[PDB]
Design a protein around this ligand. Structure first.
Ligand SMILES: [Zn+2]
Lengths: 83, 52, 69, 286, 83, 83, 83, 83, 83, 83, 83, 83, 83, 52
C-alpha cells in the first residue's frame, strides 16, 4: 500500500512543478513581446491586451488540466482503489 | 552551522552606531565639503565680475 | 486621434496635413504608423504610401524610394 | 588530531548562556552550546562587531571634530572621499529630504567592509592567540563576524524595521496597507477589488518578506563559503609533505586575490540595496 | 499488483507534465511573435490571427495524444491486465 | 512479469512525453518566424505557408516514429515475450 | 509510513524547486524587455511598469499554487492519513 | 533476466525520445531561419531550400543511428544473451 | 528514520540547487539588457539601475522562500516528527 | 551479471541519446546562421559552406567518441569481466 | 546508516553541480553583453566593467549558499546526528 | 561487487554524455557567430578563424578532463580497489 | 560499503559532467559575442581579448572547485571514513 | 608536521600575498589620493588669485 501512496505524491509534484516551470517561462516570453509592442505603439495597447489574453488561454490550457488531475490524485486518489 | 542566539544584541548595536554617525560624524564633514565648493564658486564668479 | 505628416522631396512638398494612420513599404517589411508611435527611421523601397484620415480614408501617393522618419 | 576534528573546531562559536545550573557560564562543547536556547550570546561575534564599529567611528570623528574647510590633511582627505562617494550614491537613487539615509549608508558600507576584512588574516592566528592568552587548548573563537547567520540577520532585520517605519511614516497606515492590498491590481467594481485583495497580498507580501532574508543570506553565503575554502586549503599543509605545501600556497594566494574583490563588492551591494529599498518605501512606484 | 499501479501514476504525470511544459513554452514563442506582428501592422491582426490558429493546431497535435493516453491509463489501466 | 510491465508504462510515457515536449517547442520556433514573415510581406504568405509544411514534415518525422513505437508497446508487448 | 513521509519531502522540494527555476528565468525574460523598452522610451516608463506587473501576475500564478500545496504537504499530510 | 529486459525498454525509450526531442527543436531553429531568409530573398528560395537539406542531413545523422540501435534492441537483444 | 533523513538531504539539494540554477540564468538575462540599455543611453544609467533592482526583488522571491525551507529542513525536521 | 549488464543498456542509451540531442540542437544553431549568411550575400555561399564543415568537425568530435564508446559497450563489455 | 552517507554524496554533487551549471551560463550571457557594449564605445569601458561586477554580486549570491552548505556536508554532517 | 561496477558504467555515460551535449550546443553558438561575421566581413575571415580557435580551447577544457576520467574509470576502475 | 562507493562514482560524474555542460554553453555564448565585435571593430580585438579572459575567470570559478572536489573523491574518500 | 606545519604554511602564503599587495594594490590607491590632494590645492589657487 505504502508504495502506491508514496509514488502518488511524486506524481502530483511533477504534474504541478512541470506545469509551473513551463507557464512561468511561457509568460516571460509572451509578456516580454507585449512590453516591446506597447513601447512601439501606445495607441494599440487596448487591442494588444485582448490579443495577449487570447494567447494566454492557449498557453495555460494543458497546465490547467494537469493541476486538476493533481488535486484529484491528492483528494480521493484513483489508484488506491485499483489494487 | 546555524543556532539562533545574539540576534537582538547585534540589532541594537547597529542602531547605536548609525545614530552616532548621523549626529556627530556626518554634518561637520558635509559643511567642510560645501565650503570648498562655495569658495571656488565665489572665486570663479568674482573673476567673471572683474571682466564684466 | 491624429498626427501631423509631411511627404517632402529635395525639390518641393508632395503632401502636408493631419492623418490617423500611415502605411508604407520599409526595406525589411511593411509598416503601419499611428499617433504616439516610438521614434523610427527606415529606408523605403519604390511603391505607394497610403494615408488615412476622416473622409480621406484612401489618400495614396506613389514614392520612388527615400527614407521614413 | 584529525582533519575532521580541525574542521569541526573552526565551525563552533564562543557561546555564553543558561547552563543546567546558572545563567553565568561558557559552553565547553558544541552540544553544551546547542542546549543553550534562544536566550544565549555568541561572545566572539559581539566582541568583533562592536570593537570594529567603534574603531571606524572614532577614526571618522577624529576627521570631523576638527574639519579644516580648506586644504585637507591625509586623514580627512580619505574620510571626505568616502562621504562624497556615499552622498553621490544616495542622490542618484533617493530624491527626498530624509537626513537618516546618508549616514546609514556610510555606516552600513564601512562596517560590513571591516567585519569582512579580518577574513584575509591567516585562519589559525586569532583562534590560537585567544587560547594562549586564556590558558586553554579547547577554546572556541571565530574572528569573521559576517560568517555567523545571527550577525547578518541582525543587520537586515534592522534595515527591514526602517523600511516598515518610513513606509507608514510617509504613506500613513492606510497607504501602507493600500500598497499591500490595492496594488498592483485595482478595479472600479466592488466585487472585483475584494477578489483581487488576496492576489495583491500574495504578490506584495512575498516580495516584502524576501528583502531582509536575501540581504542576510547573500552576505552569509559569500563569507561562510569564503572562509571554508581557507580552512580546507590549510589541511593541505597539515599533511606535512613538500609538493603539497607548495601547491597549497598557490591556492591560498589565488583565493585571497579573488576574495578581496568579493569583500569589497559585498559591502557595496548591501549599501546599494539599503539605499534602493529605503527609497522605494517613500514613493508609490506603480 | 502494486508496482504496476505505482509506476503507472508516474507514467501519467510524465505524459501530462512534459506536454504541459512544452506547450506553455511553445505558445510563449509563437504568441510573442503574433503580438510583435500586430504592433508592426495594426491592420493585419485579423490575417495574422487565423495563421496563428493553423500553427496552434500543429503545436498541440502530439500533446493531445499524450493527455488522451494519460486519462486512459488513469481510468482504464491497460497494464494491470498484462501480469 | 510485474517489473517488465511496470517499466513498459514509464517507457511509453518517455516516448510520447519527450516527443510532445520537442514538437511543441519546435513549432513555437518555426511558427513565430512564419507570423513575422506574414506581417512583413503579406504577398509572400501563400509561398511561406507551403514552405512551412515542408519543414513540419521533417520536424515531426522522428516524433511520429516514437508515438508509433509507444502504441506498439501499449497494445502488444515485445519484452513480455522475452520473459 | 517512512517511505510515504520520505517521498513527501522530495515531492515538496520538487514543487518549490521547479517553481523557483521557472519564475527566475521568466522574470529574467520579462524584466529584460522592460529595461529595453525603458531605455528607448523613458517617457513611457510609468506606463510600461504597470503593464509589466499585469504580466507578473500571470507568470507566478501556477508557481504560487505549487508553493501553497508544498507548504500544505509539510505542516499537514493528505497521504499519511490515506495509508 | 526480468531486470535486464525491463531496463532495455527504458534504454529504447531514452534512445528514441531524446533523439525526437533534439530533432524537433533543431528543425524549429533551422526552419525558422529558412522562412526568414525566404521572405528576404524570394529569388534565392530554390538555392536556400537545397542548402537546408544539406544541414538536415547533418542534424538527423546521430538521431538516425539512435533509432537504428533502438530497433536493434527491440527485435533482437545483445543483452538477453547475458553476455 | 534512515530513509526519511537521507531523502531530506536530496530534498534540500533540489530546493537550493534548482533555485541556484534559475537565479544565475535569470540575472544573466536581466543584466544583459541593463548593460545594453546603459550603452544606448549613457545618461539614463542611474534610472536603469534603480528599476533593475525592483525587478530583482520579483526575480529572487520564490528562490529565497526555498533557501529558507531548505535551511528549516537541515536544522529542524517536520517529517521526522511523523515517524 | 544481471545488474552490471542491465545498467549497461541504460549507459548506452545515455551516450547516444545525449549525443543525438546536443548534435541536433547544435546543427540547428550552426545551420540557421549558414542560411542567414547565404541570404545576406548569395555569392559568399561557396566559402560559407567550407567554413561550416570546419565547425561541424569541432561540433561532432565528442559525440563521435560517445557513439564509439556506446558501440564498444554493446558488442564487447569491459564491465562484464571486472565482475 | 550507509543510505544517509551515500545520499549526502549525491546531495553534495547536486548542490555544487547545479551552481557550476547556473553560474557559467548566467555570466556567459552577461559577459557577452559587456563585450558588445565595449565594442560600441570603448570610452565607457571602465564604467561598464564596474556595472558588470555590481550585477555579478546578485547573480552568484545563492550559488555560494549551496557551495558553502555542500562543503559543510562533506566534512561535517547534520544528518548523521539525526540517525 | 555488481553495484560498484554497474554504477561506474553510468558514471562513465554521464561524463561523456553531458560533455557531448554541452560542446555541441556551445560550438553552434560560437560557430554560428563565426559564419555571421564571415558573411558580413569576408576579408577578416583569416583573423576570425584564429580568434575562434582560441575560444575553442576554453570551451573544450573541462570536457576533455571528463573524457580522460571516463576512460580511466572504464579501463582502471579506482573504486573496485576501495572494497 | 558498496553503496557509498558506487554512489560516490555517480557523484563524480555529476560534479565533472554538469560543469563540463555549463562551461561549453557559457564559452559559446561569450566567444560568439567576441567574434561579433572583432568583425564589427577589427581594431579593438587586442582590448576585447583581454576583457574576455577576465570574464572567463568568473565563468570557470565554481566549475574548478567542483572538478577538484571530484578528484578528491576518486583518490581519497571523506564518506568511506564515516562507515 | 600538522598544526606546526599548517601555521608556517599559512603564514608563508600570507607573506607572499602581502608582498605583491603592497607593491600593486596600495601604490595606485595612494597615487589616486595624492592626485586629489594636488587638485584641491591647484583649484584653490584660482580663488586666491581672484582677490588680486
Ligand atoms: Zn503603487
Amino acid at each position: 500500500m505504502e508504495t502506491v501512496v508514496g509514488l502518488t505524491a511524486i506524481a502530483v509534484a511533477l504534474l504541478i512543478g512541470l506545469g509551473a516551470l513551463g507557464t512561468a517561462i511561457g509568460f516571460g516570453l509572451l509578456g516580454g513581446k507585449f512590453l516591446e509592442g506597447a513601447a512601439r505603439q501606445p495607441e494599440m495597447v487596448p487591442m494588444l491586451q485582448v490579443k495577449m489574453f487570447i494567447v494566454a488561454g492557449l498557453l495555460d490550457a494543458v497546465t490547467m488540466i494537469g493541476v486538476g488531475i493533481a488535486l484529484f490524485f491528492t483528494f480521493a486518489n484513483p489508484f488506491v482503489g485499483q489494487i | 552551522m546555524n543556532i539562533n542566539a545574539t540576534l537582538i544584541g547585534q540589532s541594537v548595536a547597529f542602531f547605536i552606531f548609525v545614530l552616532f554617525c548621523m549626529k556627530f560624524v556626518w554634518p561637520p564633514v558635509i559643511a567642510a565639503l560645501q565650503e570648498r565648493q562655495k569658495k571656488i564658486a565665489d572665486g570663479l564668479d568674482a573673476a567673471n565680475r572683474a571682466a564684466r | 486621434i491624429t498626427v501631423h505628416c509631411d511627404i517632402v522631396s529635395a525639390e518641393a512638398e508632395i503632401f502636408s496635413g493631419l492623418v490617423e494612420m500611415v502605411i508604407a513599404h520599409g526595406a525589411l517589411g511593411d509598416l503601419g504608423i499611428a499617433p504616439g508611435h516610438a521614434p523610427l527611421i527606415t529606408d523605403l523601397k519604390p511603391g505607394p504610401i497610403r494615408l488615412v484620415k476622416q473622409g480621406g480614408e484612401q489618400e495614396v501617393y506613389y514614392i520612388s524610394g527615400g527614407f521614413l522618419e | 588530531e584529525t582533519a575532521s576534528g580541525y574542521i569541526q573546531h573552526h565551525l563552533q562559536n564562543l557561546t555564553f548562556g543558561r547552563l543546567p545550573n546558572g545563567d553565568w557560564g561558557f559552553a565547553h562543547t558544541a552540544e553544551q552550546a546547542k542546549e543553550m536556547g534562544f536566550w544565549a550570546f555568541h561572545v566572539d561575534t559581539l566582541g568583533w562587531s562592536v570593537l570594529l564599529g567603534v574603531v571606524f567611528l572614532f577614526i571618522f570623528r577624529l576627521a570631523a571634530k576638527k574639519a579644516t574647510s580648506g586644504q585637507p590633511g591625509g586623514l580627512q582627505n580619505f574620510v571626505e572621499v568616502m562621504v562624497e562617494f556615499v552622498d553621490t550614491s544616495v542622490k542618484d537613487t533617493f530624491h527626498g529630504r530624509n537626513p537618516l539615509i546618508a549616514p546609514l549608508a556610510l555606516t552600513v558600507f564601512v562596517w560590513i567592509f571591516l567585519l569582512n576584512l579580518i577574513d584575509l588574516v591567516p585562519v589559525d592566528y586569532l583562534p590560537m592567540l585567544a587560547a594562549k592568552i586564556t590558558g586553554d587548548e579547547h577554546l572556541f573563537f571565530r574572528a569573521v563576524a559576517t560568517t555567523d547567520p545571527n550577525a547578518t540577520l541582525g543587520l537586515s532585520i534592522s534595515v527591514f524595521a526602517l523600511i516598515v517605519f518610513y513606509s507608514i511614516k510617509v504613506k500613513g497606515i492606510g497607504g501602507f496597507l493600500g500598497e499591500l492590498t490595492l496594488h498592483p491590481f485595482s478595479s472600479k467594481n466592488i466585487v472585483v477589488q475584494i477578489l483581487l485583495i488576496p492576489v495583491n497580498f500574495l504578490l506584495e507580501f512575498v516580495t516584502l518578506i524576501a528583502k531582509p532574508v536575501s540581504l542576510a543570506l547573500r552576505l552569509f553565503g559569500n563569507m561562510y563559503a569564503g572562509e571554508l575554502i581557507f580552512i580546507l586549503i590549510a589541511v593541505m599543509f597539515g599533511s606535512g609533505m613538500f609538493l603539497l605545501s607548495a601547491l597549497g600556497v598557490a591556492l591560498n594566494w589565488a583565493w585571497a586575490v579573488f576574495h578581496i574583490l568579493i569583500i569589497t563588492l559585498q559591502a557595496f551591494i548591501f549599501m546599494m540595496l539599503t539605499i534602493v529599498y529605503l527609497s522605494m518605501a517613500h514613493e508609490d512606484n506603480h
